[PDB]
Design a protein around this ligand. Sequence first.
Ligand SMILES: CC(C)NCCCn1c(Sc2cc3c(cc2I)OCO3)nc2c(N)ncnc21
Length: 208
Amino acid sequence: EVETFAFQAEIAQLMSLIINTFYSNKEIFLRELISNSSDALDKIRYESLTDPSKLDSGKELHINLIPNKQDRTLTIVDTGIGMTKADLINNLGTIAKSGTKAFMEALQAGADISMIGQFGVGFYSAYLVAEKVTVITKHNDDEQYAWESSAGGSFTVRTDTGEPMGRGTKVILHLKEDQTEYLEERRIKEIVKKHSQFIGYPITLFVE
Ligand SMILES: CC(C)NCCCn1c(Sc2cc3c(cc2I)OCO3)nc2c(N)ncnc21
């Protein structure tokens, strides 16, 4: 049972720029996603200090990197705060509007795509390497949802009847045909060591 939504014009614009601009340093997408996971984990930890029951959905706070050549996907999994339906459909977009505006102006002023994180919109860097991104997420007091978008100005959201995750987010990157290097263990290990060696949570890189 799928609902389809239009990205706010600004977000659609950011995505086009990301997909269209010639920029070779694509590997920064992983750092942006791992960072978002780190932030989510930080929040659920902080919240658990005043309400321990919030960890009933899972006490483990970590990150998993799962590559799959068969499906040509790279999934970044975390046990963080998760996102609600309201987050996925309106709230995160509202916030992303200002970040986008600032980021695009900063670019014209000499900045580059690798700085997208300082504007709160790093998630969209996933499109530097993915033709389609599917996001499975579960927040403590909402249901598990599946958000998805191949850009083009729209995204869908549905209640996920798959396999329960308890609490957290899974960013599934359906890679572009010429970006399969991100499925190789050596390459992923290289990027993590280069841009995310100090994340304060365990990061497990699965092998195939
Ligand atoms: C609330 C605070 C933690 N900031 C969260 C920003 C949204 N977000 C993001 S960035 C993001 C993710 C999206 C999205 C928009 C953004 I911005 O629509 C598709 O899924 N990653 C998160 C994650 N791994 N866990 C929880 N929240 C995530």
